Each structure stands twice: as C-alpha cells, then as structure tokens.
C-alpha cells in the first residue's frame, strides 16, 4: 500500500483579481425590486 508519503506543503493558486464584490452596494440599495418584478444581475470579476 502507501504510508510512505504524506503532503505537508499546500499550493493555493487563484486568479489575481483583487477587486472586492459590490455586495455593500447591491445589498444597501435605497430600494429593492418588488418580488413580482425581481431583478437579476451578473456579479463578475470580483472577490466575494
């Protein structure tokens, strides 16, 4: 079997986009949609 090798180092690699997502704006809009007319928005190129 194998008990020889166990990982110890961790290689974490992510796209280097650093712009934080606009949640503070999306959530704090002065008004939201009426549920019958709910609105869909793309969230992209950001860190959630």
């Amino acid at each position: 079997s194998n008990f020889r090798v166990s990982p110890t180092k961790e290689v974490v690699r992510f796209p280097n986009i650093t712009n934080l997502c606009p949640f503070g704006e999306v959530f704090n809009a002065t008004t939201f949609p009426s549920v019958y007319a709910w609105e869909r928005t793309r969230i992209s190129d950001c860190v959630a």
Partner: protein, 49 residues
C-alpha cells in the same frame, strides 16, 4: 451386412493442434488508492469499513 467387414488398407499420420489456456494475468489492486485516491479524509472514512 452380417457377413462383411471393412479393413483399412492404408493409413495417414496426422498432426493435430490442441490449444489450451493455462494461466491468466496476475492482477493486484491497491484498494485504498482505488477508492480514496490520495485524499486523507476519505481514507479515514474508509477505515470505518
């Protein structure tokens, strides 16, 4: 007919080929590597089997 017999007057030497299996491929399974890959977390659950 109750009173006649056929006798061979000649013969043929024949060579015939009989093919027989005797072994199969020896196989081995690392049951941990097959089930869990390398993931430590799954290997801990596999111990519970």
């Amino acid at each position: 007919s109750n009173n006649t017999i056929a006798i061979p007057t000649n013969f043929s030497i024949s060579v015939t080929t009989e093919v027989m299996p005797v072994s199969m491929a020896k196989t081995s399974v690392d049951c941990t590597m097959y089930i869990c890959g390398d993931s430590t977390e799954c290997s801990n659950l596999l111990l519970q089997y």
